[PDB]
Design a binder for this molecule. Sequence first.
Ligand SMILES: CCCCCC/C=C\CCCCCCCC(=O)O[C@H](COC(=O)CCCCCCCCCCCCCCC)COP(=O)(O)OCCN
Ligand SMILES: CCCCCC/C=C\CCCCCCCC(=O)O[C@H](COC(=O)CCCCCCCCCCCCCCC)COP(=O)(O)OCCN
Ligand SMILES: CCCCCCCCCCCCCC
Ligand SMILES: CCCCCCCCCCCCCC
Ligand SMILES: CCCCCCCCCCCCCC
Ligand SMILES: CCCCCCCCCCCCCC
Ligand SMILES: CCCCCCCCCCCCCC
Ligand SMILES: CCCCCCCCCCCCCC
Ligand SMILES: CCCCCCCCCCCCCC
Ligand SMILES: CCCCCCCCCCCCCC
Ligand SMILES: CCCCCCCCCCCCCC
Ligand SMILES: CCCCCCCCCCCCCC
Ligand SMILES: CCCCCCCCCCCCCC
Ligand SMILES: CCCCCCCCCCCCCC
Ligand SMILES: CCCCCCCCCCCCCC
Ligand SMILES: CCCCCCCCCCCCCC
Ligand SMILES: CCCCCCCCCCCCCC
Ligand SMILES: CCCCCCCCCCCCCC
Ligand SMILES: CCCCCCCCCCCC
Ligand SMILES: CCCCCCCCCCCC
Ligand SMILES: CCCCCCCCCCCC
Ligand SMILES: CCCCCCCCCCCC
Ligand SMILES: CCCCCCCCCCCC
Ligand SMILES: CCCCCCCCCCCC
Ligand SMILES: CCCCCCCCCCCC
Ligand SMILES: CCCCCCCCCCCC
Ligand SMILES: CCCCCCCCCCCC
Ligand SMILES: CCCCCCCCCCCC
Ligand SMILES: CCCCCCC
Ligand SMILES: CCCCCCC
Ligand SMILES: CCCCCCC
Ligand SMILES: CCCCCCC
Ligand SMILES: CCCCCCC
Ligand SMILES: CCCCCCC
Ligand SMILES: CCCCCCC
Ligand SMILES: CCCCCCC
Ligand SMILES: CCCCCCC
Ligand SMILES: CCCCCCC
Ligand SMILES: CCCCCCC
Ligand SMILES: CCCCCCC
Ligand SMILES: CCCCCCC
Ligand SMILES: CCCCCCC
Lengths: 729, 729
Amino acid sequence: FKLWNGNFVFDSPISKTLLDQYATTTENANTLPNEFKFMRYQAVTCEPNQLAEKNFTVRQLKYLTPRETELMLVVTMYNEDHILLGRTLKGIMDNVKYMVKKKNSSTWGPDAWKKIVVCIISDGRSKINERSLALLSSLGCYQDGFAKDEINEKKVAMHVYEHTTMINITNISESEVSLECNQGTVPIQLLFCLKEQNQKKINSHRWAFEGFAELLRPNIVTLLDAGTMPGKDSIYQLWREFRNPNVGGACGEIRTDLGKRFVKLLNPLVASQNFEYKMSNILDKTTESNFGFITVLPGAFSAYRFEAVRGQPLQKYFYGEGFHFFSSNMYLAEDRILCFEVVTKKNCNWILKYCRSSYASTDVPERVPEFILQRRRWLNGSFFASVYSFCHFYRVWSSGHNIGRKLLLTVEFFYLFFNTLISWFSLSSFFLVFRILTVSIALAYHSAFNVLSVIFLWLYGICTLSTFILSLGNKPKSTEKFYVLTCVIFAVMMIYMIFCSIFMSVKSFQNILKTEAFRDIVISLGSTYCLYLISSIIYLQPWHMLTSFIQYILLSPSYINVLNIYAFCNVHDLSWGTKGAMANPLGKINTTEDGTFKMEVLVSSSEIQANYDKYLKVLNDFDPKSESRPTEPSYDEKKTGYYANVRSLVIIFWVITNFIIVAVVLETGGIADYIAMKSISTAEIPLMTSKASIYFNVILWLVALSALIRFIGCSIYMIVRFFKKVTFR
Amino acid sequence: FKLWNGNFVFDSPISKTLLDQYATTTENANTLPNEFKFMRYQAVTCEPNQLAEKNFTVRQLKYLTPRETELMLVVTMYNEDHILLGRTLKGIMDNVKYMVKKKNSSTWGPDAWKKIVVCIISDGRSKINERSLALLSSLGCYQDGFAKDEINEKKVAMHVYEHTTMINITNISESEVSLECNQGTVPIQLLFCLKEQNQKKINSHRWAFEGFAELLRPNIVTLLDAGTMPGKDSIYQLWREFRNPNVGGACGEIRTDLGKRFVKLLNPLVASQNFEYKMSNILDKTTESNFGFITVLPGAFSAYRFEAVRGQPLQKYFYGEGFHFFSSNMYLAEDRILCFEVVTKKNCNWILKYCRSSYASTDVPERVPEFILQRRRWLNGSFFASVYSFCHFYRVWSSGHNIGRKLLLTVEFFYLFFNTLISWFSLSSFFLVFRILTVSIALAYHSAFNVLSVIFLWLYGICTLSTFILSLGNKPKSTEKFYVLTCVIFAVMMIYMIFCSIFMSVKSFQNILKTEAFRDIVISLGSTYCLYLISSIIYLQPWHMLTSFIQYILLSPSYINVLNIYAFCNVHDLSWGTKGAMANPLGKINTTEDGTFKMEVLVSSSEIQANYDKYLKVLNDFDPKSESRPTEPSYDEKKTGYYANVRSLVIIFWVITNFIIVAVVLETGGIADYIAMKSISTAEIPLMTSKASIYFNVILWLVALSALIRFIGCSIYMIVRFFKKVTFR
Ligand SMILES: CCCCCC/C=C\CCCCCCCC(=O)O[C@H](COC(=O)CCCCCCCCCCCCCCC)COP(=O)(O)OCCN
Ligand SMILES: CCCCCC/C=C\CCCCCCCC(=O)O[C@H](COC(=O)CCCCCCCCCCCCCCC)COP(=O)(O)OCCN
Ligand SMILES: CCCCCCCCCCCCCC
Ligand SMILES: CCCCCCCCCCCCCC
Ligand SMILES: CCCCCCCCCCCCCC
Ligand SMILES: CCCCCCCCCCCCCC
Ligand SMILES: CCCCCCCCCCCCCC
Ligand SMILES: CCCCCCCCCCCCCC
Ligand SMILES: CCCCCCCCCCCCCC
Ligand SMILES: CCCCCCCCCCCCCC
Ligand SMILES: CCCCCCCCCCCCCC
Ligand SMILES: CCCCCCCCCCCCCC
Ligand SMILES: CCCCCCCCCCCCCC
Ligand SMILES: CCCCCCCCCCCCCC
Ligand SMILES: CCCCCCCCCCCCCC
Ligand SMILES: CCCCCCCCCCCCCC
Ligand SMILES: CCCCCCCCCCCCCC
Ligand SMILES: CCCCCCCCCCCCCC
Ligand SMILES: CCCCCCCCCCCC
Ligand SMILES: CCCCCCCCCCCC
Ligand SMILES: CCCCCCCCCCCC
Ligand SMILES: CCCCCCCCCCCC
Ligand SMILES: CCCCCCCCCCCC
Ligand SMILES: CCCCCCCCCCCC
Ligand SMILES: CCCCCCCCCCCC
Ligand SMILES: CCCCCCCCCCCC
Ligand SMILES: CCCCCCCCCCCC
Ligand SMILES: CCCCCCCCCCCC
Ligand SMILES: CCCCCCC
Ligand SMILES: CCCCCCC
Ligand SMILES: CCCCCCC
Ligand SMILES: CCCCCCC
Ligand SMILES: CCCCCCC
Ligand SMILES: CCCCCCC
Ligand SMILES: CCCCCCC
Ligand SMILES: CCCCCCC
Ligand SMILES: CCCCCCC
Ligand SMILES: CCCCCCC
Ligand SMILES: CCCCCCC
Ligand SMILES: CCCCCCC
Ligand SMILES: CCCCCCC
Ligand SMILES: CCCCCCC
């Protein structure tokens, strides 16, 4: 063969069984376009940054009339099953089919399938699922065979497969995938590109944004994840948000999958997450979109404009530039930095908008060990992305917005840090609320309320201590039975804490009709629970305020005492290092010959004496006077020693600054003794002071105050969207 | 060559420069015995258990008159310097020289160097120090060259080098080693045997006890360690302990090296360990030897009788037989099991005796991070070896002792467990002593004693919490500067605690001459410190009660709060597992040809269709109805999950059972509130109760009581030895 400009570009045909299916579609089975009956293979053996410099090309450039690209759909995966992968492909194909049948459109039409380009980017050739790859092979986009790993002393970086198929999935069952090819199917051009070795996930986005997108030059770049299934017309609704030239990014809403006939609602750990997803798409995202800055939830469905993300925003996302705090830990925020660098771009004005008429369902974990490992990634990233934004809020004023937008963004950057500070102090708030409430009901009614207030404290301190020891030196998959018991214990504590307040409040009412507990039934149940229901009704989805609202309350104590403790003890996921310097000089003959053969035996007396004097000389030049610097750690074992130091300094500052709040309200830590000894000179300790009644009201005023802003923000968004709908109708 | 019975046995000569030195010794430089001018090499390529079964042999068996062995000295090492190795060899050579000049002896004499056989067992061929091996090469016991790694599809297990040298070291300086060969030097038979791959240290003892010792068949087997230097005649004095046939093992005493002209006494961390070594060889070892059961200190100098340790004692030391508590953690006790299985041997009667006229000096750590990592091995082994002995104390009565010895051993097995229980509860004892003493001086004199009692509690709780976080998820070599600060803080706390007691006691005396603090200067300073001095004077080494007694007191709080915390959080030294299943099918050509060459390209349409059909068939047979058992952990990654579970269960039971003692004396943990609420029905909390004065005397009575037994035991041993000396004179 004659390789093309130093590159191995091969062109193979397809199976005979597959071509016959395509032949039935046309009205004359004699000829077919070359794009429908071939599969271009090529090896890259270079970097994604210099893909266009090494005379590399894609299949879209070399046409009689060059094709333009309007949407580039990226779909990353890593050893997912062949059922999770099919769900995303089925959702993608239906949207493309929908966008073809549009009658009146200046962009889309009956020949609009030449714009969308699907791009699957797998990770690792030895880690991809065996069954998932067979699904791609059944679509005509994979052929076993050519896997050249090197070309002229150049290891290949990644393999590129590409083909324009005409088979789209019809129905995904629980154990089967239905494939069909009829007159009502649209062709989908695939660009399956498989990587060689495992390189995390940020490198996968580097192969797309800096790689193929640099050759195709699309308008919009949409990000997906294997498992997420877009809706019937979710692709089209998200594309309509770029009508005005100010938007530089968008995302829809994400929903949980309830199985078949709503069967997955009996699980207390699935119904709990069904209420948390709803309350995040109704109270938080709308309020963030009002100002003009949003952060996409993990697993969601997002799209960026390729003109906005080009240059500085992409330079500080991939590389980001030692061992400095804001440069070495910045990978923990995932892509939340990309959303922040777009709004604050110099001499430009881009805003992020939240679309509501585009949804994407997904599955959720149903076991406890698997559910803890997932939130570990979310919490560590949502905590660092708000500390980075607050310390760099001055960069908004160097942008190109007007005067109103800058002031509106500065307020939101403070309102987010206030929410972060509330969540940082939530470990010492729950204990104080639990302790000032059980004691206060024992000083008023006695009876059996005196022993129950001592059993629950010891049952709390034992479960809290065991979570710190099992998170610093153990895995959550080994000891699975203990976490379930801890969750049940916390749920029971929550039930008792709820009952005590109702009892005290009803007694207070009966003793004044026939105060800390008087306004406790007025602000924590009348102004917090009512606004949630009103906001849900306004959002026109009021069917989750009774379905799965009880289960979320019982698992509330396990969101701040089992999930925050594990997420802070595992920040960087270090691995130290073993290595080893095996003796390179080895394999001295094999003596395979049974006998006779003597090989080479040194008998040279002079050589023997030279060797003996060569070992005798080593003991001479030993003087340690010039003490050389000890062998410093490489670079891979010295960076690990830095991740272990910035992680032990966060656990200490999180425990010490939370115990100070407890030793100012409860007068623990030896402070009450100090007052008593000061009072015995000019001698006893009260059980409860007056500082436990001021604090018990402040921590409940902030809870209902933060639920008041989320209602005004949710209502303004709907009011504006209703007028937009009326005007555009 | 004609290999011997399936074994590669080669015989090389020595360097010409080395033979000339030997030639000067004899009175006729014409001939020399073959043992003095050759070096036998052999590869083992088998197991130590079956060394004699594969027709293997040593150089001592094939003589005109077979030689018998009286002492087999084992010297293990692992990447030690060439100065530490020379110190042991110089000490060994001087003892052999001393044992030759004895005039009247029925065993030793002028030709007694044929009995002692030195055996150096290095570990790892790629880990041995390159400079230390040159010292062996300069002795005529190593030749670079033949290092065959395989023979007829059989990997070599270990390499055997052996030669009878005649050069002994004269003086070891700080940077040089002096070698000489004169008329007053004795030959030493070396058996340097170098291992192939790193296999810990228990395997090294298996190569000796089950290996060479099975062919040489010695009388006594002495154990050493590179770095330990025996005394002038320490070998001979330890051999005299086997005169009577009841002894089945012995050991001497170990001392610290004070450098040159006592220069290493200025270090507070070296002087502290100088007083701990003395108090262990004067109060503990003598008392244990009185009963008849002793445990050798780490790094010491011990000897066993090969007849006593043969069979069951060696079968349960190496193998010891699942995942059971007393079978999987038994490797933590090192060789302390061997000492226990000798005394309780079935139908036999062996006792362990402690010799006092044989010493061996060694170096000690002088940095803090290096000192913490060493005691981590000692504490984890001395705690498990006493729990195993107490739960199996019934095995003494099945032995062959008389009636008195069984009763004497049963008492000692309880007295050791009592000492272990005292040390298990030492975390909550120091805090109680520190807290009941600083508060009590603030309720009597006020002034500045009210603020100092609150600063020290907060300064204690911050240093105690940071030691649990830095030991469960960090290495002690990284954060070196924090441990030094923690030690200084604890030392200052100790000084303040000492001053408070003296102040209170002198006030108590002055207020009765012109009670908890009255007998506090009578039992904790009059009956504890005096008995130490009396025992030291009786031992005839009373020069360490003022030299390094102050430094040991200041570092006393750091022996139970920095060393016990780190030793319990790191019990098994687990490493989890990474592994990885790299794609075995790989290496798809190299395409090295610049052009033209097409190699093999499949174009077979039928084969292509068959391939497409075999990838299409995988999606068919997928039915998950028969849910197979998930892939269980191998055996190496499942055992690690068991070591992590038995280690988190020890840290929890050590913290919970120590906080209960604090919540019964100080009435913390919510218990005082319970009493107050019970008292408000039929309402305040006292600062100090009467249980803090009963406990403060009990914990000081046990301290001076345990120092009273160690004096009687130390005196009885010396009284008996004096009569033995008088009778044997
Ligand atoms: C010997 C200890 C064994 C257990 C170790 C557990 C693990 C980690 C280290 C813990 C360090 C703190 C040990 C406190 C020991 C204790 O039981 O001491 C009590 C409680 O004292 C209080 O206030 C209670 C303080 C609770 C602290 C919880 C953790 C806080 C972390 C940050 C610590 C910062 C400094 C805190 C200093 C106290 C003193 O009671 P009292 O004599 O005043 O009772 C007077 C009644 N009339
Ligand atoms: C929110 C916590 C943040 C810090 C977490 C630190 C790390 C690990 C988990 C610690 C679990 C225990 C938390 C105790 C919280 C606390 O500050 O609570 C106090 C102290 O209470 C006491 O007694 C002091 C108890 C000290 C316990 C030290 C460790 C013991 C380990 C085993 C625990 C076994 C169960 C113990 C139950 C208490 C209640 O003070 P009060 O309202 O009675 O003061 C009345 C004055 N008139
Ligand atoms: C008569 C006053 C004392 C009554 C004590 C009753 C205790 C009942 C405890 C029941 C279990 C509580 C949860 C473990
Ligand atoms: C004088 C009476 C004292 C009674 C103390 C009762 C203490 C009960 C502790 C229960 C702990 C339960 C842990 C699971
Ligand atoms: C199979 C995984 C289940 C996870 C949730 C466990 C239950 C949590 C709530 C318990 C409530 C108990 C009320 C009595
Ligand atoms: C005079 C009425 C006394 C009522 C006492 C009730 C005690 C609490 C009972 C329920 C405890 C929590 C069970 C989960
Ligand atoms: C100095 C850089 C390394 C820090 C390692 C962690 C030190 C933790 C102990 C000190 C905590 C101080 C809290 C006020
Ligand atoms: C070599 C030592 C490196 C220490 C790095 C410490 C970085 C600062 C950590 C601050 C943590 C603050 C948490 C709120
Ligand atoms: C390292 C910082 C330590 C701060 C300690 C603060 C202790 C609490 C002081 C409370 C003062 C007011 C008491 C009523
Ligand atoms: C989550 C809010 C943290 C900061 C405020 C905490 C309370 C401060 C004390 C309030 C009570 C009054 C004490 C004098
Ligand atoms: C006049 C009564 C109060 C006096 C307070 C004096 C405090 C002195 C503290 C000195 C440092 C203590 C160790 C940090
Ligand atoms: C009403 C006056 C209260 C005074 C409280 C003083 C607390 C001092 C705490 C010192 C902590 C030092 C840690 C290193
Ligand atoms: C170089 C390593 C030193 C280790 C010991 C540090 C000092 C311990 C004792 C401090 C005493 C301080 C008295 C004021
Ligand atoms: C009436 C006399 C009062 C004396 C007060 C002494 C206070 C303690 C001083 C030393 C503190 C510890 C220093 C290391
Ligand atoms: C009374 C203390 C109970 C502690 C339970 C939590 C620790 C469990 C560790 C893992 C145990 C695995 C075998 C059951
Ligand atoms: C698979 C779970 C294994 C758990 C093993 C637990 C063994 C017993 C540990 C007891 C520790 C006692 C310390 C005093
Ligand atoms: C798991 C075991 C828990 C035991 C709790 C014991 C608490 C202390 C009881 C003290 C009773 C006497 C008080 C004066
Ligand atoms: C180290 C000894 C541990 C066992 C005994 C601990 C003290 C027991 C209580 C003594 C005081 C009296 C309480 C009623
Ligand atoms: C260079 C590192 C700076 C870290 C700044 C952290 C600020 C945290 C919030 C402080 C105010 C509550
Ligand atoms: C972010 C939440 C912080 C903690 C708020 C209070 C939790 C307990 C509420 C109990 C209601 C009965
Ligand atoms: C969550 C509530 C659990 C207990 C059931 C309600 C108890 C109400 C008591 C009212 C007394 C007047
Ligand atoms: C930032 C750590 C928590 C403490 C915040 C300040 C508390 C001041 C209390 C003053 C009481 C008089
Ligand atoms: C973050 C908001 C903190 C508000 C603290 C208010 C404290 C008020 C003390 C006096 C009440 C009468
Ligand atoms: C099978 C495991 C048995 C462990 C026994 C431990 C005993 C510890 C001492 C109990 C009495 C204080
Ligand atoms: C094994 C030792 C346990 C703790 C004994 C008491 C320690 C503090 C002594 C203070 C003397 C002034
Ligand atoms: C270890 C002692 C440090 C303080 C110096 C001695 C103080 C003695 C005070 C006596 C008062 C009567
Ligand atoms: C074994 C764990 C520590 C507790 C030992 C028993 C204490 C009993 C105290 C009884 C007080 C009335
Ligand atoms: C291990 C020895 C424990 C001894 C406990 C004695 C308790 C005595 C209580 C009554 C004193 C008057
Ligand atoms: C998943 C079946 C119900 C579990 C209930 C746990 C409390
Ligand atoms: C770059 C660090 C800025 C800190 C600001 C704290 C208000
Ligand atoms: C130029 C910086 C202006 C900050 C305004 C904060 C409200
Ligand atoms: C972007 C339209 C003006 C906003 C002004 C906010 C004060
Ligand atoms: C009144 C004391 C009761 C102790 C046992 C409660 C279960
Ligand atoms: C899946 C394991 C369930 C254990 C329940 C313990 C209460
Ligand atoms: C349309 C701008 C609204 C700003 C205030 C949002 C709460
Ligand atoms: C080793 C030189 C003296 C150190 C003293 C540390 C307190
Ligand atoms: C084999 C376990 C014996 C336990 C004895 C406890 C006294
Ligand atoms: C046969 C067991 C006898 C035990 C005696 C203990 C003193
Ligand atoms: C071994 C000599 C007899 C000892 C009896 C101890 C009671
Ligand atoms: C009397 C209060 C003093 C507080 C500061 C002590 C250093
Ligand atoms: C060797 C490092 C010494 C640090 C001293 C800090 C007080
Ligand atoms: C010679 C036996 C002595 C037994 C008692 C030792 C304290």
